[PDB]
Design a protein around this ligand. Structure first.
Ligand SMILES: [Ca+2]
Ligand SMILES: [Ca+2]
Ligand SMILES: [Ca+2]
Ligand SMILES: [Ca+2]
Ligand SMILES: [Ca+2]
Ligand SMILES: [Ca+2]
Ligand SMILES: [Ca+2]
Ligand SMILES: [Ca+2]
Ligand SMILES: [Ca+2]
Ligand SMILES: [Ca+2]
Ligand SMILES: [Ca+2]
Ligand SMILES: [Ca+2]
Ligand SMILES: [Ca+2]
Ligand SMILES: [Ca+2]
Lengths: 319, 319
């Protein structure tokens, strides 16, 4: 169990009682959204599975579809998201980003770039069972060129596992190689860049990016903005952020989702849901440090209603 | 479904008739090995299955069991081998290689590196279906290290599968990558090697190896002999030979089993049996081309008795 999540297993818990309470609030006049939120936002993801199992034993009807009926708008999205397992959620999100004409580059990049080997292995499995097809083949189908190559590599989830040993020689070499394949020469050797950033372990790459500043006038992120463009650039920039500092990566995505006019609800929700039981505490930490005010504070200003309430619960506090 | 095999189905078949003559030969005084070979080594594997059935039905005893008792030495091994189905044979040999302290690396490598996806799948099914445990597990328990990773990957039999289109860009990239991962750098990146050599299709790798010769002063085989050692080396050398020219791979194996004093009978017998209905013609072709005389010739010189005849029948002709 991750210690940096914001949402934790409810101390004293009973699935069957929750199921009853949920249904009650669902049957009530005008629906008792408040209750449904108060319960689901304060139960771990695994406890939610049990509640969905119990609710079906009582009503013979699937909790998800029931709640889908009683709810609507952004709130519905949030709840239906908190009910799926992490892999199911991520799988459905990856499927959604590729559904129809076009590709939601942003969201495809976000998931594939931040998930770990362990998380990806489970996603590939669930994605197959859920959509009777492989994530890979789906990815190869909606993307092309170098972006496709990069996304396929990351989705494999075969990055080397971090070793107890620091390979200073390899770090330097990988550093020079990154400089030689880009800033140092006209054009770019994208395959070399891809090879290294997807195969080396994160800890190792973190040091590589540091050594890299010793050979290049520009750091990795900057060098990227200069060497590539389009979806490719977007991908590398996201991936490098996830390697250097993931909690920070998400705090920035969260900031971008609310900073301006309106709200990019699709992004805000996915993060608040998927990272609630992972590193929400570090994210809030990085967010508060960088922007001056709490994440909580931004959510208050950008959202309202039960929807807001839901998000503020997943946030955890820092009011 | 193997136009290049030397042993093909006997036209006027009669599982019954054959079964009878077998029983007669077995019950004859001193045992009539001559007619037993004359029959079994001229009937297709699928046919021998029917003969085994008709025989069991008539004697209430198992043909294999009967012959094991009636025969001995090298002949017994040849016959007992021919009675098992391709999958069953490979399975047993495979198991035979790992049973007992230590591991017969050569036998294990030969089978794992030369079998195609289809053949491997059926072996995986028939293996557990025989020793009540996944082949992979047995392999993992007997193997260790880089050697293990390679054997496990090959065993899965999930190599890319063979297309229409030649991917020139990928052929070059793989070659350059193989060099960058081996001869060009201090040490070796065994994972990248395993990755490329186990996941790309054979027609593709053949070109990869040719193109590789454009980056390195030494070809793949030689590069391997310099980059790695022990079982790992042994495996790679075999694997690459199977990719470049399988019939030649086997001709070379057959030649090594007889070139010197005595005879590595196990190897000779396994190849003669396991390849008799697959590519024995190309193997004989490649053999005569490289060594001057025919395979028939070498077998003739290295073996005698009824054992000799069986091998000569499995071989084909080309006196
Ligand atoms: Ca209401
Ligand atoms: Ca609804
Ligand atoms: Ca699409
Ligand atoms: Ca788009
Ligand atoms: Ca450049
Ligand atoms: Ca650019
Ligand atoms: Ca806003
Ligand atoms: Ca005799
Ligand atoms: Ca015997
Ligand atoms: Ca053993
Ligand atoms: Ca050994
Ligand atoms: Ca080397
Ligand atoms: Ca060596
Ligand atoms: Ca000899």
């Amino acid at each position: 169990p991750s210690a940096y999540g914001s949402v934790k297993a409810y101390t004293n818990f009973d699935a069957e009682r929750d199921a009853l309470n949920i249904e009650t609030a669902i049957k009530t006049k005008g629906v008792d959204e408040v209750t449904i939120v108060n319960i689901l936002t304060n139960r771990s993801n695994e406890q939610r599975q049990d509640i969905a199992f119990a609710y079906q034993r009582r009503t013979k009807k699937e909790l998800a579809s029931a709640l889908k009926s009683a709810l609507s708008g952004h709130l519905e999205t949030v709840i239906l998201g908190l009910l799926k397992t992490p892999a199911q959620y991520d799988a459905s999100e990856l499927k959604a980003s590729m559904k129809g004409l076009g590709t939601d580059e942003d969201s495809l990049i976000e998931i594939i770039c931040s998930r770990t080997n362990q998380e990806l292995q489970e996603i590939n499995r669930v994605y197959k069972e859920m959509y009777k097809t492989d994530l890979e083949k789906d990815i190869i189908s909606d993307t092309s060129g170098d972006f496709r190559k990069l996304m396929v590599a990351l989705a494999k989830g075969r990055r080397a596992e971090d070793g107890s040993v620091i390979d200073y020689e390899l770090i330097d070499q990988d550093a020079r190689d990154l400089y030689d394949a880009g800033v140092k020469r006209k054009g770019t050797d994208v395959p070399k860049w891809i090879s290294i950033m997807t195969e080396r372990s994160v800890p190792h790459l973190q040091k590589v990016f540091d050594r890299y500043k010793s050979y290049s006038p520009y750091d990795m992120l900057e060098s990227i903005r200069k060497e590539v463009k389009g979806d490719l650039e977007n991908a590398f920039l996201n991936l490098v952020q996830c390697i250097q500092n993931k909690p920070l990566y998400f705090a920035d995505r969260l900031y971008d989702s609310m900073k301006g006019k309106g709200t990019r609800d699709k992004v805000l929700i996915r993060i608040m849901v998927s990272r609630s039981e992972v590193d929400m505490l570090k994210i809030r930490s990085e967010f508060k440090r960088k922007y001056g005010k709490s994440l909580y504070y931004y959510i208050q200003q950008d959202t309202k209603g039960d929807y807001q309430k839901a998000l503020l619960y997943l946030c955890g506090g820092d009011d």
